């Protein structure tokens, strides 16, 4: 259950911070360690939850900005050399 892994690896708190960072230990290194601890099958699902979760920490976020948060997140597996490297977030 990807949901469990997300919660277990600190709801990818560091990736939340990276996703906020770019949508308007070093943080990225922590992100990639939290995400590595999630199973490959569950990384994109968990990044989805990180994006949702990062929305809470900041003001109301418009749908353009939210899409940008998803865009950032989708680049994180590849940045970290983590399979599956990309997330479509369909």
Automatic annotation (TrEMBL):
Keywords linked to the UniProt accession: Disulfide bond, Seed storage protein, Signal, Storage protein
Bifunctional inhibitor/plant lipid transfer protein/seed storage helical domain ranges (all copies): 2-87
Disulfide bridge partners, by residue number: 2-42, 15-31, 32-80, 44-87
GO molecular function, one term: nutrient reservoir activity
Family per similarity comment: Belongs to the 2S seed storage albumins family.
Name this polypeptide is given: 2S albumin
Native source organism of the sequence: Moringa oleifera (Horseradish tree)
Interval of the full protein contained in this chain: 40 to 158 of 163
